[PDB]
Structure formats: structure tokens, C-alpha cells
Amino acid sequence: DYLRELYKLEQQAMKLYREASERVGDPVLAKILEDEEKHIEWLETI
Amino acid sequence: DYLRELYKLEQQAMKLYREASERVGDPVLAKILEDEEKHIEWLETI
Fold first, then answer.
1. Of A5, A10, A16, which has the smallest distance from its Cβ to B6's Cβ?
2. B40 in Cβ contact with A26 (< 8 Å)
3. 20 to 30 A from B19, CA-CA: which of A33, B9, B11, B31?
4. Cβ count within 10 A of residue A30
5. A6–B17: do the CB atoms touch at under 8 Å?
6. How far is B15 from chain A (nearest CA, A)?
7. Could A24 and B35 be called an inter-chain contact, meaning their C-beta atoms sit closer than 8 Å?
8. How far apart are CA A36 and CA A42, in angstroms?
9. Interior CA angle at B17 toward B27 and A43, to 5°?
10. CA dist., res. B16 & res. A39, Å (int)
11. What architecture is the A1-46 domain classified under in CATH?
12. What's the CA gap between A13 and A21, in Å, rounded?
């Protein structure tokens, strides 16, 4: 259901937030990434 | 660049987190949504 494509969305966000952090180099980009990580965990409880 | 498709990703996440919160009804789903919102704002400073 939703959870499953919401889960994948979180995975792409981390992938593209990773390729973006490497380059851009805005520390807040790394901050947004620590979050997406926790979103995955919380998603993991439904 | 990345920022632009990272921005759109955040928009879809909120759209699908909204349709998912309405239904599922897991309060943490609303918590993940208040976040995606701030990610948009922080994204807005690059």
C-alpha cells in the first residue's frame, strides 16, 4: 500500500540527498539526511 | 540541478504522506510530515 511507496520514496531521497551532499556541501543537507533516516525507522512501525 | 529534483521529491513526499495520513491515521505519519515541511524551507536556502 502507501507505506511501501512511501518507503521507496524515502530511499530515493537519501540516494539523491547523498549525491547532493557530496557535491553541494551544505551541512544542512546532511541534517535533512539524518532525518530521512529516522523517517525510515518510524515508517518501519506500521 | 539536484536542489530542483530534491525539491520536487519533497513535494511528492508531502502529497503521499498527506493521502496516507488521512487514511492510515498513525500520528507519527503527521510527525514525518511536519519535517518534510522544514526540509522544504531549508532547501530554500541554497
1. A16
2. no
3. A33
4. 12
5. yes
6. 10
7. no
8. 10
9. 60
10. 14
11. Up-down Bundle (1.20)
12. 12
